[PDB]
Design an enzyme around this catalytic site. Structure first.
Site: not given
Ligand SMILES: Nc1ncnc2c1ncn2[C@@H]1O[C@H](COP(=O)(O)OP(=O)(O)OP(=O)(O)O)[C@@H](O)[C@H]1O
Ligand SMILES: Nc1ncnc2c1ncn2[C@@H]1O[C@H](COP(=O)(O)OP(=O)(O)O)[C@@H](O)[C@H]1O
Ligand SMILES: [Mg+2]
Ligand SMILES: [Mg+2]
Lengths: 505, 460, 173, 51, 85, 171, 49, 85, 115
Positions: A369-372
């Site tokens: 998940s690139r949003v973290g």
């Protein structure tokens, strides 16, 4: 009762002539008509056919227009007259169609009378600009322990559910929708090329297990024309983009973006447009790219200038969960790789975990998940950091577990705990789990309260713990479900709850 | 009077020019005398001024440019009703059994729209079958679609003859058999089998064999549906067996390029998904009546990834994937328990013991698969004891999935076995719980209930 | 369809007829070429695979009552490209191009019965105010109109029939 | 079950209402075909030719 | 039905002069420019493999002698070239 | 009847089709390559005595005529997924697969059981052959499974050992 | 309730057969503005039944 | 000039072909003299229909142990021999 | 004065027709008044007869078949130099930020030869 309203319809009528362009159908084939005339046709205009069918003007060639029929086409004929409307494709929008099932044109198939939409929106719209867009830092809880702990989703993010057939892609999406029953997040399910009895079974599950009041269902069945399938998702985005620009959060699920790509391929090839890598047209990237980049979180300045000063301090958003089907898990195919580049995190659903019964079959390490953790709430963030490491260590130490024993007790402990946290992260289909329930179950795993219970009872242990917690300490569950806050007092109270529960069954 | 003339004849595709008024509409029929032979043409496109491009429902040989064509102002229309029971027909609904006229009361057009979304009816009325593996792994309800997927020679036909025996004889309702692209010998063998068993009086048969020109193989599936839909609208419960969905799509592929269409991904037509959808969305159980359907699906080259099998997977309630490996190993029926499934396999709608047994069986066999190449290279001695246990129980489970069929007796020289659903659960649960751990693997192979496993074990 | 291959030759002829002040002669010359091109034997000569030079002589000789600039060249160049079946389309292309330069519209009117010639003159002057051209009405007596009139002005139309309003009301219900 | 019956009510009303609409407009067509005069055709056209 | 490289001003010249040889066979006009490939009209005295001299000090190499046009590849920057040179 | 190389026919038809400018399909074969071989092969058949009597205008009575066909195909490197092999495999009543590995190993005729089938099967045999051959068909297929699975175990169960030996004997 | 709405529709149908008599003559003059002929009311009852 | 004989391709057929090497058009190439045909027949015909068939219960013997035990062929079957070169 | 007409629109590909004297050079930029906006086209190929084939540097929706096209003599020209520092621009050198107009002194074409 009835016929005074028909009298009223006679009253509400226009007796004078009006003027427009008029075209003649030259050819009919496979859902495509060639139209001679219409010097005033424009790209993407709606052409009105006899029978209250529309066509979409796609090709403008030097002497003919190529238009695609949005409906049953087979009775059209050469020499019929087609009138040009001046409209780029509009669909109804509003709260009045919140809770109903419609087609791509927005006409209801529900059978339950007409809509009370507040107005109309263009199906094609440009996305919010770079400066008009705000950072994602609010949660969307999916209600599955594995996703919400490892692969967090935020209000404005665009996660991809990519997997093979029959692995729970739909099950995960509709459970996401069901968990929104009481959040302010409205929900949209777009069914592209699904078979109608499957859609009907889903819709019935949506009413039965919770609320279909909060969801708009857009349907384009496999029997309907490719134009209606292709456009469908854009029509759903126009319905969700209504809430985003009003200041309210929303969540749209697009089911099979691969079927939308197939529909566009059919339309492109029948219009003779040059083929690309898998015969897909050259702009197949620009199809999904311009679809998904409408999913955004948007700042208060934009939403105040859009609404012209009605909401003032809100920030709207539109979360998107596209669904993609790989074939034998090929991740290098053209449509999957396009969508994986367009989105920002994927929930990869592996098939041999699903066959193994570890449902939901999410696969960590390849699902990111690139949003973290800016999308997680704080208690879920604190209690989930170790889970990722524990499963990583279980990946490597799973090879040893197959055939070997009398390893170092450090390793032995680590492997065992890995196998039992793996056992913990699985749940029944239509049970969603609130943040407080997920929290305490993860705390039980992370603080070691399971370390002596590392046996098959873990499923019964969780169900008993959830019942016990509900029975005795519900004001804590209210406080966590409200705040998601975490501190030393909460840490101690969670210890007290776990210590007491071990004394019971 | 005749009103059009043939202007091109390229292979199977015929173009006809008409006056620019009263050009035939799409899907209409046309008629031409191919010498003494009355030949039907179906209109596929209105292209250009006054011209229509069409497919021959018969051989294209013997046609000249400039022949007169007469336009029938309707689609191909077929006899429907009780008069179709016991009769073989072609795609045009003409008798091919030499018993005389059909004697129909009514005729219906083969092109019609599917039921509206509000007409569809929900069902979970699970059918029981004698087949162990199917009833364990992929049980299916009355009113559902079943697909048998396999490559060449894996048992699609033998399975479908067994299912016709087990289901149709208990079924009191009328049935339709659509032999799309069937081998002519197999069609004769089926007709004689039904005629001997005296069940031919409740089956209507439509046969379009391999030798026939592409239009017949293309449209024969729709004549099958049109008959089944007549029975459904009378309110009956109907059984529809379709011999290959694949050779409908293939009959579309052959003619697609001559119709001017640009080719798609694997040479398929651009309209593959719509052509599959429009046919398969008619095969549904409505509020008025139910169609229950079993379809065999050819898998080209034995790859489940080919567009044609790949799309049809999304239409079916149960999918029984047969595999060539298991057939080559000699285990019959060759059902892959890991790939096959049903949407009726839910703990809510099956018994929860059934569901638990199924999850156990699948978990065990998956755990065997990953061990296979490890044993092959590094050897069985480098397993552990609990894996040596689960590899044994896996082999016992993988034998107890095999079964003798009454229709697969001619091939093997043994009687046929029908197992009740309850006995199947009871056996697989007993094997997994290890109540039969001490019996050899062959004590489970090719047997009926687990009481027969202990009888044969005693003989062993 | 031949419209696309007609367009280069029709534009070259129309662009040329105004360089030589004989549009009116060119129009009837092309109407001639369109009528001969329909002949059943001439179409067999056209389909007969002669070489273009000898086919050109076999067509130019048969259509000799044409100017050197006009007949013998346009017919030959279209014959090398095999476009002569485009001639009925080259004609209509030519006419339209003219009506464009002359600021004219060949307006059609349709009615259930004849108009009073005051109605019709009012229609002319009003269409000439709606458009910006000299209109040229031609009427049609279609009994399905029942009452009112249709005005068609090329690609644009103006429905005043009662039948259209009746079927519009049937759908407002 | 109340909401399901309300859906069948609306559908049955709508089907009757459309039937009577079709009868009404077919009768209006016959009335238009018979009740007409040239001074009334011209009266209609004089609303038209203003535009 | 594709247009085989014949276009209205050129057609008007043939209408005016039914035999084309009135122009010298050493010269021609560029009729299309597409990504480096150029398509000259004229040059009845050109042979395959010649060095056709473009405006500026550029050359293009004759590759196809078709019935009515020469196809050549430009040796250098092609973007400056138009129709009618 | 033996068709020597239905593959080279498919190649000849492809050449004719392309020279005639018909639209190419997969591997450039025209689409009616399936129709070519299917109309050819379904001509091989057995016909009932009523058909014979009708055809010969009464001269021959009480006899069923028959035509049997043995088409041959070449695959490149054993690739069965290619277009023409796929068509013919789909049309025919069975397969005999002959393999390079078996031929070089010295198993000649190089038939591979378990990849070859006869769908007529037991009906086309004498009763003795029917009886004896049923045991062979399973025994060799399961023998190759055991022979793969037990390459490395130096000692074995004699039940399995027995089977293994018997399989080498029949091979 | 399904049998109820059936008989309710049956009661409505006869009363709407009266209202649809009115609507044909009202709307067929509405569509031409000028009033219809009282005499031409002949053949209107054909619509009725 | 080409004339159109309105007849499809027909081939010599009969008992007198047994032992003869023949080209596709029926011309002997063995050089052993002309054929003795029992009339001609058409090359392109249609097959017997479903009602006209009979099932296969008679064997045709290969003579090979592997084939005739494991993969039996009967009189009316259509067996494919497939493999490499 | 705008000297060309649109003759085709197929997706993002627009074809425009000019007089034979005026035909654009290969990478020239053209501008159309689509709706109320201005659309920039970049020329890609000179087909014969004064038609040039072009890619739309923006949305193609709403283009009719007869709109007038203005032929700029330069390619796409963008602001350069110090004024661009701190600013976000699109392809055409226009601010996608909302700070305001870029105070450039010089505009350079995006296409040139390497050193
Ligand atoms: N958590 C779960 N526990 C048990 N069963 C589950 C779970 N999730 C899904 N299933 C079952 O898995 C099956 C497949 O689910 P689903 O239809 O969502 O997969 P899919 O990937 O959408 O398949 P398709 O792509 O063909 O639609 C269904 O029978 C569903 O009931
Ligand atoms: N259950 C079975 N028992 C015995 N033999 C079988 C069984 N299933 C398949 N076979 C063998 O495999 C053959 C091929 O399968 P079949 O169903 O006839 O064709 P397909 O599988 O291609 O439809 C059968 O004819 C038979 O020889
Ligand atoms: Mg699913
Ligand atoms: Mg089969």
């Amino acid at each position: 009762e009835i016929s005074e309203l028909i009298k009223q319809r006679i009253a509400q009528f226009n007796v004078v002539s009006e003027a427009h362009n008029e075209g003649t159908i030259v050819s009919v084939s496979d859902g495509v008509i060639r139209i001679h005339g219409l010097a005033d046709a424009m790209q993407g205009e709606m052409i009105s056919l006899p029978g209250n069918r529309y066509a979409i003007a796609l090709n403008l060639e030097r002497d003919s227009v190529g238009a695609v029929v949005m409906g049953p086409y087979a009775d059209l004929a050469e020499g019929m007259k087609v009138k040009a409307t001046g409209r780029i494709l509009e669909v109804p929008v509003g709260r009045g169609l919140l809770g109903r099932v419609v087609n791509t044109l927005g006409a209801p198939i529900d059978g339950k009378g007409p809509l009370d939409h507040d107005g109309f929106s263009a199906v094609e719209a440009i996305a919010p600009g770079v400066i008009e867009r705000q950072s994602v830092d609010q949660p969307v809880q999916t209600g599955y322990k594995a996703v919400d702990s490892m692969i967090p989703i935020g209000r404005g993010q665009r996660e991809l559910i990519i997997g093979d057939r029959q692995t729970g892609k739909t099950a995960l999406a509709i459970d996401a929708i069901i968990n929104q029953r009481d959040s302010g997040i409205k929900a949209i399910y777009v069914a592209i090329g699904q078979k109608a009895s499957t859609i009907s079974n889903v819709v019935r599950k949506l009413e039965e297990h919770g609320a279909l009041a909060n969801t708009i269902v857009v349907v384009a069945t496999a029997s309907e024309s490719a134009a209606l399938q292709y456009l469908a998702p854009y029509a759903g985005a126009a319905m969700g983009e209504y809430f985003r620009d009003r200041g309210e959060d929303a969540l749209i699920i697009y089911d099979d973006l691969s079927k939308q790509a197939v529909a566009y391929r059919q339309i492109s090839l029948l219009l003779r447009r040059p083929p690309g890598r898998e015969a897909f047209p050259g702009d197949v990237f620009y199809l999904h790219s311009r679809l998904l980049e409408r999913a955004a979180r948007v700042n208060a300045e934009y939403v105040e200038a859009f609404t012209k000063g009605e909401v003032k301090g809100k920030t709207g958003s539109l979360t998107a969960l596209p669904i993609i089907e790989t074939q034998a898990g090929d991740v290098s195919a053209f449509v999957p790789t396009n969508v994986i580049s367009i989105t920002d995190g994927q929930i990869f659903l592996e098939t041999n975990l699903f066959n193994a019964g570890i449902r939901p079959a999410v696969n960590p390490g390849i699902s990111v998940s690139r949003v973290g953790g800016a999308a997680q709430t704080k208690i879920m963030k604190k209690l989930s950091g170790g889970i990722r490491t524990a499963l990583a260590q279980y990946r490597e130490l799973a090879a040893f577990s197959q055939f070997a024993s009398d390893l170092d007790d450090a390793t032995r402990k680590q492997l065992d705990h890995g196998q039992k946290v793996t056992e913990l992260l699985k749940q029944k289909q239509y049970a969603p789990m609130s943040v407080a329930q997920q929290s305490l179950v993860l705390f039980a795993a992370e603080r070691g309260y399971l370390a002596d219970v590392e046996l098959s009872k873990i499923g019964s242990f969780e169900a008993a713990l959830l019942a016990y917690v509900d029975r005795d300490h519900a004001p804590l569950m209210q406080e966590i479900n409200q705040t998601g806050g975490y501190n030393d007092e909460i840490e101690g109270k969670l210890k007290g709850i776990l210590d007491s529960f071990k004394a019971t069954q | 009077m005749a009103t059009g003339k043939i202007v091109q004849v390229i292979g199977a595709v015929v173009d006809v020019e008409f006056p620019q008024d009263a050009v035939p509409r799409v899907y209409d029929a046309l008629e031409v005398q191919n010498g003494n032979e009355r030949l039907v043409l179906e209109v596929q496109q209105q292209l250009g001024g006054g011209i229509v491009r069409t497919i021959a429902m018969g051989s294209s040989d013997g046609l000249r440019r400039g022949l007169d064509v007469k336009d029938l102002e309707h689609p191909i229309e077929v006899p429907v009703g009780k008069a179709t029971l016991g009769r073989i027909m072609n795609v045009l609904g003409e008798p091919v059994d030499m018993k005389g006229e059909i004697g129909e009361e009514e005729r219906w057009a083969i092109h019609r729209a599917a039921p509206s979304y509000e007409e569809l009816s929900n069902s979970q009325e699970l059918l029981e079958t004698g087949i162990k593996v199917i009833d364990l792994m992929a049980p299916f309800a009355k009113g559902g679609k079943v697909g048998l997927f396999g490559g060449a020679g894996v048992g699609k036909t033998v399975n479908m003859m067994e299912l016709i025996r087990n289901i149709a004889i208990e079924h009191s309702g009328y049935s339709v058999f659509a032999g799309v692209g069937e081998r002519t010998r197999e069609g004769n063998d089926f007709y004689h089998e039904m005629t001997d068993s005296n069940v031919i009086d409740k089956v209507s048969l439509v046969y379009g064999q391999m030798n026939e020109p592409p239009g017949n193989r293309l449209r024969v599936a729709l004549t099958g549906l049109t008959m089944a839909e007549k029975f459904r609208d009378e309110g009956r419960d109907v059984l529809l067996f379709v011999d290959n969905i694949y050779r409908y799509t293939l009959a579309g592929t052959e003619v697609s390029a001559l119709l001017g269409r640009m080719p798609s991904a694997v040479g398929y037509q651009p309209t593959l998904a719509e052509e599959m959808g429009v046919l398969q969305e008619r095969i549904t159980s409505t509020k008025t009546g139910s169609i229950t359907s079993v379809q065999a699906v050819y898998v080209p080259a034995d790859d489940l990834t080919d567009p044609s099998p790949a799309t049809t997977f999304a239409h079916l309630d149960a999918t029984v994937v047969l595999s060539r490996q298991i057939a080559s190993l000699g285990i019959y029926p060759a059902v892959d328990p890991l790939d096959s499934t049903s949407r009726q396999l839910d703990p809510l709608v099956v018994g929860q013991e059934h569901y638990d047994t199924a999850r156990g069986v699948q978990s065990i066999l998956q755990r065997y698969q990953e061990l296979k190449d490890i044993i092959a290279i590094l050897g069985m001695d480098e397993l552990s004891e609990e894996d040596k246990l689960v590899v044994a129980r896996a082999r016992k489970i993988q034998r107890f999935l095999s079964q003798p069929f009454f229709v697969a007796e001619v091939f093997t020289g043994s009687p046929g076995k029908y197992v009740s659903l309850k006995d199947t659960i009871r056996g697989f649960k007993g094997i997994m719980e290890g109540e039969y751990d001490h019996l050899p693997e062959q004590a489970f192979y090719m047997v009926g209930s687990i009481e027969e496993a202990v009888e044969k074990a005693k003989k062993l | 369809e031949f419209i696309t291959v007609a367009r280069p030759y029709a534009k070259a002829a129309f662009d040329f007829a105004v360089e030589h002040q004989s549009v009116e002669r060119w129009q009837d010359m092309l109407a001639f070429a369109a009528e001969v091109t329909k002949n059943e034997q001439m179409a067999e000569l056209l389909s007969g695979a002669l070489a273009p030079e000898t086919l050109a002589e076999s067509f130019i000789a048969v259509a000799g009552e044409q100017l050197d600039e006009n007949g013998q060249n346009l017919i030959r160049v279209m014959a090398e490209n095999g476009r002569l079946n485009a001639l009925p389309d080259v004609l209509e292309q030519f006419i339209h191009l003219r009506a464009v330069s002359e600021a004219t519209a060949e307006v059609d009117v349709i009615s259930a019965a004849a108009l009073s010639e005051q109605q019709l003159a009012k229609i002319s002057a009003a269409m000439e105010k709606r458009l910006s051209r000299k209109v040229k009405l031609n009427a049609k007596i279609d009994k399905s109109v029942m009452a009112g009139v249709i005005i068609r002005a090329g690609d644009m139309v103006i429905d005043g029939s009662v039948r259209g309003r009746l079927e519009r009301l049937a759908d407002v219900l | 079950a109340q909401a399901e019956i309300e859906a069948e009510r609306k559908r049955a009303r709508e089907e009757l209402r459309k039937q009577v609409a079709i009868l009404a407009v077919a009768g209006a067509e016959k009335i238009i075909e018979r009740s007409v005069d040239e001074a009334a055709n011209s009266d209609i056209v004089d609303k038209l030719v203003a535009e | 039905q594709l247009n085989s490289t014949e276009i209205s001003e050129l057609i008007k010249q043939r209408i005016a002069q039914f035999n084309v040889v009135s122009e010298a066979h050493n010269e021609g006009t560029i009729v299309s420019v597409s990504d480096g490939v150029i398509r000259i009209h004229g040059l009845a005295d050109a042979m395959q493999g010649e060095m056709i001299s473009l405006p500026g000090n550029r050359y293009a190499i004759a590759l196809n002698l078709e019935r009515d046009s020469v196809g050549a590849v430009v040796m250098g920057p092609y973007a400056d070239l138009a129709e009618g040179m």
